[PDB]
């Protein structure tokens, strides 16, 4: 009989049951989306978008609902921290319900198409054999895709008839769903410009409509029909798999580097914002502007939003996780409660010292303190017998500005060293480690997990492409080579052109 | 709720093992020569 890895080939010459299997796959995927959303709603804590946003809580589909304008719950909260909002039907719960109902209806349609597989529609009128006219199907579907793409851009994203999309300031402090106008100049191709997302769907949609009409009306050239085996549905599987692994690599890339469609309030910050001290630079800019305006140091640092300080912390860096460190980021360092304030270290001479921050590469990292010019001034030694820079020898103290510890100074060396250990992670926070029995080991965010799965699946689908492209172009030898294969076709010198018997 | 930590695997194997036994028997009945 059929080997186990070929059982689904019974669908190749059965368009009705292929449609049924596709309906069932679609029902399963829509049912997953609804189930996933319900599980996330049953576990999501909406009480603090500042220090406990969705991306600290292992939320995977919640940011996708929020990206396109679903931001409220029927229970009255919104993901930007509002109370008493009325989302209408299209709350997170309504989206989930709609996907469950859709799943059931697709399931029922699959049953019908499996039973009533032998429709006259699926038969070639000339031969009575099962037959799909794939070139024209492509035109019909491309036209439909173009209409839907165009409408998404022109009505939903613009807010002309729909909610818009998630947009934010460059530091992810005030994100919300807004109407977005298309950007028709060259900055439309800037990945960080949301107006280019709008212009893309308008323009690509129109192009899809036009090309769809072309593909409905114009038959394939005989030479391309033959070369790509356009009578064989497996050629479509091959090229569709290729398009899909291309798209999967793209969404993995824009998730990892960031773009207007992967905002940091939904998926968390990027590793590159830590690499470039993106948030530390803006924090220092704001503090210096406050000081120049006559603020005291405590006032300058107390003016830093805790949300901004929280981005300047390596526990939110998505390149700090582990493959089998499962669950939400809160399961590691804990549920963030409050900023402790900015720690300023000083030695006994009163020089300000700076803790060297941990690069993402390092699971562990020493404690080394430099002055403003990078000269080493203190550290935590490993061997003690030749220590020269210990906190005890150098009289290191730590004073806090802003946050919980504002105005406080610590001089006890073990306490100063404990804070120095936290300062290698950036800004220092108080965490609830008990509620989740957090283990103190860093985990990645949905940005990291999304990127991992999609880069992996993309690479695997490259094999699927190769495999089904080969099956298409070599269908005649799928069971073996010609048992009477002319030795002159594979020996050298018989034919001028390899494999062409007309060449002597 | 502080449920028994083995309750999940107990329930899963309770379902899975006898259901699988029946499915094996059914499918190999269907495949017999009719």
């Amino acid at each position: 009989g059929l080997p186990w890895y070929r059982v689904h080939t019974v669908l190749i010459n059965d368009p009705g049951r292929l449609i049924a299997a596709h309906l069932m796959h679609t029902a399963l995927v829509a049912g997953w989306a609804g189930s996933m959303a319900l599980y996330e709603l049953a576990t999501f804590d909406p009480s603090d978008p500042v220090l406990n946003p969705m991306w600290r809580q292992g939320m995977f589909v919640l940011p996708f609902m929020a990206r396109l304008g679903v931001t409220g719950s029927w229970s009255g909260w919104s993901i930007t921290g509002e109370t008493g909002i009325d989302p209408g039907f299209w709350s997170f719960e309504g989206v989930a319900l709609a996907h469950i109902v859709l799943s059931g209806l697709l399931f029922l349609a699959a049953c019908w198409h499996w039973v009533y597989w032998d429709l006259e529609l699926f038969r070639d009128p000339r031969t009575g054999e099962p037959a799909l006219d794939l070139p024209k199907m492509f035109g019909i579907h491309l036209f439909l895709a173009g209409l839907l793409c165009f409408g998404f851009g022109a009505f939903h994203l613009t807010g002309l008839f729909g909610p818009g999309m998630w947009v934010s300031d460059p530091y992810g402090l005030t994100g919300s769903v807004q109407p977005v106008a298309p950007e028709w100049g060259p900055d439309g191709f800037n990945p960080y410009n949301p107006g280019g997302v709008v212009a893309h769907h308008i323009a690509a949609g129109i192009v899809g409509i036009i090309a769809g009409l072309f593909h409905i009306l114009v038959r394939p050239p005989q030479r391309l029909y033959k070369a790509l085996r356009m009578g064989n549905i497996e050629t479509v599987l091959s090229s569709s798999i290729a398009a899909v692994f291309f798209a999967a690599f793209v969404v993995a890339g824009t998730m990892w580097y960031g773009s207007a469609t992967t905002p940091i309030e939904l998926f968390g910050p990027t590793r590159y914002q830590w690499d470039s001290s993106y948030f530390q630079q803006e924090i220092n800019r704001r503090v210096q502007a406050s000081l120049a305006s006559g603020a005291t140091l405590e006032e300058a640092w107390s003016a830093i939003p805790e949300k901004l300080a929280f981005y300047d912390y390596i526990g939110n860096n998505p390149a700090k996780g582990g493959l089998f460190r499962t669950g939400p980021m809160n399961k590691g360092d804990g549920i963030a409660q409050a900023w402790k304030g900015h720690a300023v270290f000083r030695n006994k001479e009163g020089e300000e010292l700076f803790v060297r921050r941990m690069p993402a590469f390092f699971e562990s990292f020493p404690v080394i303190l430099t002055d403003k010019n990078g000269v080493v001034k203190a550290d935590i030694p490993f061997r003690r017998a030749e220590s020269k820079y210990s906190f005890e020898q150098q009289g290191v103290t730590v004073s806090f500005y802003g946050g919980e510890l504002n105005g406080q100074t610590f001089t006890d060396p073990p306490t100063v060293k404990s804070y120095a250990r936290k300062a290698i992670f950036g800004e220092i926070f108080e965490f609830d480690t008990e509620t989740l029995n957090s283990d103190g080991i860093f985990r990645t965010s949905p940005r990291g997990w999304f990127t991992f799965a999609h880069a992996v699946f993309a690479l695997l689908f490259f094999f699927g492409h190769i495999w089904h492209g080969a099956r298409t172009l070599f269908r005649d030898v799928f069971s073996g080579i010609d048992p009477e294969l002319s030795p002159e076709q594979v020996e050298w010198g018989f034919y001028q052109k390899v494999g062409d018997v007309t060449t002597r | 709720m502080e449920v028994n930590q083995l309750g999940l695997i107990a329930t899963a194997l309770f379902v899975l093992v006898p259901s699988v036994f029946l499915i094996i028997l059914y499918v190999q009945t269907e495949s017999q020569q009719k």
Partner: peptide, 30 residues
């Protein structure tokens, strides 16, 4: 996890109802 388990078993039972009714062995007079 308990709630998931209870709802899972329930959902399997509803599915079984569907197959037992619409995909039964048809009664046949011989």
């Amino acid at each position: 996890m308990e709630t998931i388990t209870y709802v899972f078993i329930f959902a399997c039972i509803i599915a079984l109802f569907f197959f037992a009714i619409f995909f039964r062995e048809p009664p046949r007079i011989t």
